[PDB]
Each structure stands twice: as C-alpha cells, then as structure tokens.
From a paper:
We here used yellow fluorescent protein (YFP), which is a GFP variant that has a chromophore composed of the GFP chromophore and the phenol group of Tyr203. To summarize, though further investigation of the mechanism underlying the amino acid insertions remain to be investigated, we found that glycine insertions causes the new static water interaction to the chromophore, which can enhance the sensitivity of fluorescent protein to the hydrostatic pressure.
The YFP mutants were named YFP-nG, where n is the number of the inserted amino acids (1, G; 3, GGG; 6, GGSGGT; 9, GGSGGTGGS; and 12, GGSGGTGGSGGT). In addition, the main chromophore of YFP-3G is largely shifted. The most remarkable difference is that the side chain of Tyr145 (Tyr146 for YFP-G1 and Tyr148 for YFP-G3) moved away from the neighborhood of the chromophore, producing a large space near the chromophore. On the contrary, the absorbance spectrum of YFP-3G did not show the peak at 380 nm with low chloride ion concentration, but the peak appeared when the chloride ion concentration was increased. This chloride ion dependency is similar to that of E2GFP, suggesting that YFP-3G switches its chromophore structure to the open-conformation by binding of the chloride ion. The fluorescence intensity of YFP-3G was 6-fold lower than that of YFP, but it was still enough to be visually detected. The pressure sensitivity of YFP-3G was improved 5-fold at 300 MPa and over 13-fold at 100 MPa, compared with that of YFP. Fluorescent intensities of YFP-3G expressed in E. coli cells increased with the hydrostatic pressure while those of YFP slightly decreased.
Residue numbers in the entry: 1 to 64, 68 to 145, 150 to 233
Write the structure that this text describes.
Amino acid sequence: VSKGEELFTGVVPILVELDGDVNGHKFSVSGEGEGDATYGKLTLKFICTTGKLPVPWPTLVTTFLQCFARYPDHMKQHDFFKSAMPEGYVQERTIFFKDDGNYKTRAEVKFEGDTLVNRIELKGIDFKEDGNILGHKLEYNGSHNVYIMADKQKNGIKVNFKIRHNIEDGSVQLADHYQQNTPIGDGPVLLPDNHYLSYQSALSKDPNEKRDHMVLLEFVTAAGIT
C-alpha cells in the first residue's frame, strides 16, 4: 500500500478554514472533525465565526474532503485523491445555481502533520438578494452520485454532479457542479477510469451551540467499476 493510501488507514483529524464573499456579504467558517476512509466516514462540525451565515448551510455542503472516500479494494488504482497525498491537490469548482448566482471555490487540501487540512476561498456573484440563496428559502435537511473522469492533459481529474436543494415551497433549487482537481506536488498520481462516488449525507445541529453552525455526517463510497 502506497504512502498516500496508508495515510488513511486509520482515523484522521480534519481541519477546514473557509473565507467567503457572496455578493459582498463576507463571512468565515471554521470546521473540525475526523475521517475514517476505511469506512468512507466523515464526521464534521462547521461554525460561522463572523456571526450569521449569509447563505443557507445546505449550499455549502458540497464545499465542506473526497480523499476520505472508501474505495473498494478492486478499485484502488482509481483513487486519485489519496494518491496525491500528503502533498495534496487543489480543488476548483464553479457551482451554478439555476436562475440565480454562482459560487467559484478554490481549495487546497493537504496534510499539516497528521491533520488533513482544507483551506478554502469562496466567491459568489450575481445572486438575487431575495432569491432562494440570499433569501434563505432552502430547507436545512434537504444518496447522490459524483462523477469522476481523468483529465490526462492536466494530470488530474474532472468531476461533475448535480445537487437539488429543497425549497420551502416544495420545489427544488438546482446546483450544477463543475469541478477540477490538480496535484500540488510534482510527484506521481493515479488517473482513474470513469467512475463515481456515492454520497449519503445528513445535516444536524449541536443543541448546546449558540453560534450559527452545521453538524455534517457523510458516508462516501466509490463505485461504477465491476
């Protein structure tokens, strides 16, 4: 097993730091938790440290650690994420909210000692002040697939997927995701055959937490290659 892989055989502490600006509404979020890739398990708690989060927490779920996905033994040569560790990779995304604005994110995911860290910058523009996002019309508790393909030319991967956030009136707010990952190091990485990650997610609250926050539990499993 490679250095990349063996770095995830046990429980790994996680730290996330995000700075955002959506239509001029600036905010910061700190996250802590742990990942157990053996079980594709993520347990996290995010806290808005600047007061009230100006966007719905559900819209930040996908932004808030694919290196913790459980890759079946027979699919191990297709795990790009762990292969780039500990040096890490840069994840870039554009998330288009149908009939509203878009988020553009840049995240540097890598190890700092024994801690897996993700430093994120989020920029949102063209949002409607009273739309489903800035107007907070999305339900908090709104199995889904994330499609991965190799991008040989850029020595990384290209990822695409759609999320449908539940609107309070019963409708749905589509969030179309376009993602790219590129290694930070100059070392070797695994370029995968087409496959996907299956997500199970659940949002909750900490009963003793007064700050605006989100408790997020996820189970991520690679599939698509039999």
